[PDB]
Amino acid sequence: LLRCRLPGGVITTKQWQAIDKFAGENTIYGSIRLTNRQTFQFHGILPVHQMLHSVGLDALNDMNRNVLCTSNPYESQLHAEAYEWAKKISEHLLPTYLPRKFKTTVVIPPQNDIDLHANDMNFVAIAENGKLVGFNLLVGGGLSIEHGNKKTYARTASEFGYLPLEHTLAVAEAVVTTQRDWGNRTDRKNAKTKYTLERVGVETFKAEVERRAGIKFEPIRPYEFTGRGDRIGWVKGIDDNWHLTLFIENGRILDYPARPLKTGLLEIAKIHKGDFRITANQNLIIAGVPESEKAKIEKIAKESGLMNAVTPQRENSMACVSFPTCPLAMAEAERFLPSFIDNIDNLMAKHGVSDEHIVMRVTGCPNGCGRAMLAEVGLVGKAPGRYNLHLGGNRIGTRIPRMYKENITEPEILASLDELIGRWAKEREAGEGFGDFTVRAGIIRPVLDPARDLWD
Ligand code: SRM
Ligand code: SF4
Ligand SMILES: [K+]
């Protein structure tokens, strides 16, 4: 288990070739596993650091995790600056021993692809005239829970306020240090920032950050999210550049019979002008392709099976690694997802909603890596073949789904969804998502204040 520090998921084609070689020659699985934190993992390493270090990469006592950055903003010009800041924050946080791990993101509305509510610290970019001017700071997200332990809970991030760009690092440092000092000293299961905030209060924590940073937060500046999905396919960037986002199921890059995904990406890496961007949805963006190069790149991607069309449902589904490598796994996730979505696709067709999607995620155990606690429909592994079914999150990921059914099997899950998707297909309002529908229609009570109402 080796994971690389790769702020914003930006990796060069040179670095890619180096990791492709290592994966194929020096690991049991021979795969490259894109993670939902915009980096990659090797599984079953049989020297890694010298291979990484040789291409300018480093693997993270350090309680920091990969700093995320919106991968493919609609306003393409904004990426360079936001990425610059994600990289600066990442370096600024590099070694204060944190009570628990600390996760940070840089978000560019209207996209919440990085799933900000799953993180301790989030900087939402505010731009004027195509230039970043500052950030809205949101603090306190975290999804991990422990089965049947009402003292644990998933929590969304709280708005602190707006800060001019110049105060970014001072604020980042102040948040980290306040959490370091105030984090629960005894119990590690209560050490996370989400718990600290609930114990001392948002305003108390906010006031201390201002005191330490030497600033005063301005009121939050308007921002809205429209979705969390990647922009699969070609999108026009700046100049004559184009970005091709490839859907990679479970982010598992391996050569399969008749679908040489790994080799295909290697071939693209060899002729690609710019670099690649690993997304928070475990997909890959071939970024900065000149218009004149589109056809070449597309030919390889197409021939390799990297552009095989899937339904919008599959594009918006996610699972954590789980078995066979995860030692904490309770139920299958990555290995369960493909056939599970085959079933969901059937249900969507049956109800005439094949063109629609439901943000559906499966996490192997309550640690929550698959981010099911921010999905419209989330499955949380409880035992082999059994999961807790949660419903009621929303498309943009700002609401935690309450547990609907507990410790049930796939057939039981499918039957429940068949019923629910049917009602949704027929009773939903114009453009109303599944999660919002289950809440409006009274199928599940919403989670309004996680620390107090997540558990029944
Ligand atoms: C690969 C990934 C899932 C995926 O399919 O993409 C992953 C994989 C693992 N996570 Fe994670 N987590 C992944 C994102 C997250 C997320 C989602 C996110 O960050 O966007 C969370 C939920 C958010 C949160 O932290 O609240 C998550 C919460 C954890 C936790 C519970 C943390 C907690 O605060 O309680 C653990 C267990 C622990 O640390 O004790 C954990 C533990 C683990 C480990 C390393 C298991 C272990 O402790 O030995 C799992 C390795 C499985 C394997 O064999 O590869 N992982 N993990 C993601 C790696 C991200 C990365 O590059 O760093
Ligand atoms: S949610 Fe549980 S099973 Fe899945 S990768 Fe994380 S720790 Fe392992
Ligand atoms: K994916």
Domain range summary for the chain, segments of one domain joined by +: 1-60+227-310, 61-226, 311-453
Q: Which SS3 state, helix, strand or coil, does residue 210 take?
A: helix
Any atom of ligand 2 within 6 Å of the Cβ of 1: no
What letter does residue 167 receive in the DSSP assignment?
G
Residue whose entry in the numeric block shows the structure tokens 């499955």: 379
Nearest CA to ligand 1 atom 36: 367
**Contact status, residue 382 vs residue 374, Cβ threshold 8 Å:** no
- 61-226 topology per CATH: Sulfite Reductase Hemoprotein; domain 1 (3.30.413)
Q: How far apart are CA 23 and CA 288, in angstroms?
A: 25
* Resolution to one decimal, Å: 1.8
* Torsion angle, alpha carbons of 175, 181, 187, 190, to 10: -20
Q: How far apart are CA 275 and CA 285, in angstroms?
A: 8
Is the fold of 1-60+227-310 the same as that of 311-453?
Answer: no
Any atom of ligand 2 within 6 Å of the Cβ of 326: yes
The two structure tokens encoding residue 205: 């924590």
How far does the chain reach from its first CA to its final CA, in angstroms? 37
At CB < 8 A and 24+ separation, what contacts does 289-297 make?
289/241, 289/242, 289/243, 289/244, 290/240, 290/241, 290/242, 291/240, 291/241, 291/242, 292/240, 294/234, 294/242, 294/244, 296/271, 297/244, 297/268, 297/271, 297/272
Q: Is 369 a catalytic residue?
A: yes
Q: Is 101 a catalytic residue?
A: yes
The two structure tokens encoding residue 152: 């644990």
Residue whose entry in the numeric block shows the structure tokens 């944190």: 98
Q: Which SS3 state, helix, strand or coil, does residue 379 take?
A: strand
Give the architecture (CATH level 2) of 1-60+227-310. Answer: Alpha-Beta Complex (3.90)
Any atom of ligand 1 within 6 Å of the Cβ of 351: no
- 311-453 topology per CATH: Sulfite Reductase Hemoprotein; domain 1 (3.30.413)
